[PDB]
Symmetry: C3
Subunit: 211 residues, 3 copies
Amino acid sequence: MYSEQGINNTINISTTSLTNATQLTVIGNNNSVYIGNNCKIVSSNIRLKGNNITLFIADDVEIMGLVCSLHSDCSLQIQAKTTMGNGEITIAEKGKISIGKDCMLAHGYEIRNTDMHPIYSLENGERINHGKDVIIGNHVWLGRNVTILKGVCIPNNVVVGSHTVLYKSFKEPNCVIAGSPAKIVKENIVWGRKMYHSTMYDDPTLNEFYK
Amino acid sequence: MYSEQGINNTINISTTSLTNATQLTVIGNNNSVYIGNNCKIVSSNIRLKGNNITLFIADDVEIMGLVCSLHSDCSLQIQAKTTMGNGEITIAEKGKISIGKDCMLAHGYEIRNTDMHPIYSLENGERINHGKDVIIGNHVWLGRNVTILKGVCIPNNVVVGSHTVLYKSFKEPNCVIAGSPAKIVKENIVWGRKMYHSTMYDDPTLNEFYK
Amino acid sequence: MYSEQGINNTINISTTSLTNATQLTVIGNNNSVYIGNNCKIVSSNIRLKGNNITLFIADDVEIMGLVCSLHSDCSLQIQAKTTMGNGEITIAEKGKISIGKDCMLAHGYEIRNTDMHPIYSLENGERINHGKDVIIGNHVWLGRNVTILKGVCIPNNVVVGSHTVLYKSFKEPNCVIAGSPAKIVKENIVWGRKMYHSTMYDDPTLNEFY
Ligand SMILES: CC(=O)SCCNC(=O)CCNC(=O)[C@@H](O)C(C)(C)COP(=O)(O)OP(=O)(O)OC[C@H]1O[C@@H](n2cnc3c(N)ncnc32)[C@H](O)[C@@H]1OP(=O)(O)O
Ligand SMILES: CC(=O)SCCNC(=O)CCNC(=O)[C@@H](O)C(C)(C)COP(=O)(O)OP(=O)(O)OC[C@H]1O[C@@H](n2cnc3c(N)ncnc32)[C@H](O)[C@@H]1OP(=O)(O)O
Ligand SMILES: CC(=O)SCCNC(=O)CCNC(=O)[C@@H](O)C(C)(C)COP(=O)(O)OP(=O)(O)OC[C@H]1O[C@@H](n2cnc3c(N)ncnc32)[C@H](O)[C@@H]1OP(=O)(O)O
């Protein structure tokens, strides 16, 4: 079902895209939803509740089983060619999560800019766990059941190992991050989608990563 | 919903509590199940197998999608105002697990006092993993997919970070616990449920924790 | 029962075995499934997609809620008396996974001989993460939500702690492995199934380990 309530809510979804079994809900005003061409956003549950919310999903994006919650003044951006399996994305506290071009997120991803509940200093009663944006660079591959906490920024051309929890940002591109505490465990690499290729040179989508 | 088999089983669920979609199975005798007032115990699967088992859920408890297995002479105690998402609790070896008041347990918790199977020392043939009680103090917030194993004691007003595993007791209240191995990672704090409270002083339920 | 489709597939499931609520799908050629006596393979979903794949399950194996995916020329063998709760097994790159006798695999296991996608070194463009066989020895106990990645070999009589991820093989038998990174955390032990025993000496299945 598609469902919309409020004023100046804009919703653009190409007729060349598939939204089978997906629920989209927009409640509030000046919210915008864009889904580009040749997308498959299936069996997903997407919920925008608040004001000035922006969901932008570029062309050739495939998402299956995404559970997504966005609150007022929040935005989610997902760039072209990115693929995503079952998972969860939560944005609150007027923040932003972005996901770069040609990412590959395996089932079980949990991504959030927020803890959803405040932690205060006993010293001065002040809140000290405020939301922080999440940026996942281009060509990032998340293995199964990876969790990305607030403020985490992930460099381009990175692979995150199965069941890793990221609570801190990294700077180094072209590497594998794994373990607990999450750490760079391999450098100078590039990942691809197709195991049938002999070398990186056989995959024309990787040219920009080795030069 | 409900299904019994045995005698002198005492089951009292307040008419003011909800058990929508919940299964209660009691197989055995002299068992008592107590569910207080204004409770919401939903989409759960609770079973007691054996004798003299104690399930006590105090008032103002909300539990959704709990799978719970209780064996002979075991007791589960959940104090008032506690909320719990999806998860599992397993109790055996006629042992004990209690959960304090105003706890907030996020989806994916796993809590157990037992390994369910023996491990013995080759050195002296003795068993070395006897079950041990779990004590979760007042006002504890478990992040997602937190695992709480046998004999673990958690102090009052503690936050456990997402995907942490706890195999050991902590004694310090007012702190955040995270990482592998789990350790105090922040000190002198207090958590609340509502973000829209700027400071702890704006939260009536936090009075006690600052003195 | 099962949905089989292609040329010369052989499915041999002992008449003494229960397959309640299990879906077995075979699509391809020259595939072979053997399930031995007194097995209970229930609520599982076993998919063989490709050619020359083999699945071998020995006697007295009990599996509940297994989601299994085998590709061409792959092989899964599960030895006698092994029990398995809900979990996932994935095999590709023409590799194999082998699970020993009398293992105990708790709910949430994930076992794979492949990453499903290539990683290349920038120094020469060559692939560095080829799939690698997984071998779980006899009498291995996986606790809850254990993940076993490619190439991993686990020794006999090992307990893996719950929520442990294994990315590397171990060589030492009779130990508890846990934590992150995964390490030997207790040596010189043996586990059993029934906790009603003063000592190991009261469990006859355990004699062979001392
Ligand atoms: C959409 C889809 O189809 S994807 C879904 C299915 N696939 C997956 O989930 C991916 C599974 N793979 C993994 O999680 C990881 O192994 C991947 C691919 C990041 C890494 O693969 P590889 O490049 O072969 O890494 P390889 O195992 O060498 O590991 C590299 C190093 O990190 C170390 N390491 C790997 N994981 C960990 C860990 N969890 N903790 C500590 N160290 C680790 C290894 O010991 C190794 O160290 P060493 O070189 O000093 O000996
Ligand atoms: C019931 C519900 O609705 S809950 C819904 C879902 N929400 C969640 O699961 C909450 C997610 N948050 C977390 O898991 C934790 O970070 C929290 C909330 C417990 C604590 O958050 P914060 O107070 O912001 O502290 P923060 O996460 O920055 O960590 C504090 C210190 O611990 C460190 N740390 C955090 N996680 C880890 C980790 N896994 N390993 C090692 N160190 C860690 C941080 O790096 C920081 O170190 P520093 O001394 O350099 O600052
Ligand atoms: C089919 C079925 O019925 S299975 C049912 C479900 N059961 C389970 O999932 C099993 C749950 N148990 C576990 O995951 C593990 O604790 C088991 C049993 C291997 C380990 O149990 P035990 O033998 O009692 O060992 P326990 O965890 O104390 O031992 C851990 C040791 O290494 C350390 N350790 C344990 N876990 C960790 C961890 N996650 N990270 C770091 N260190 C750890 C502990 O400190 C302890 O050593 P210490 O006392 O010197 O400090």
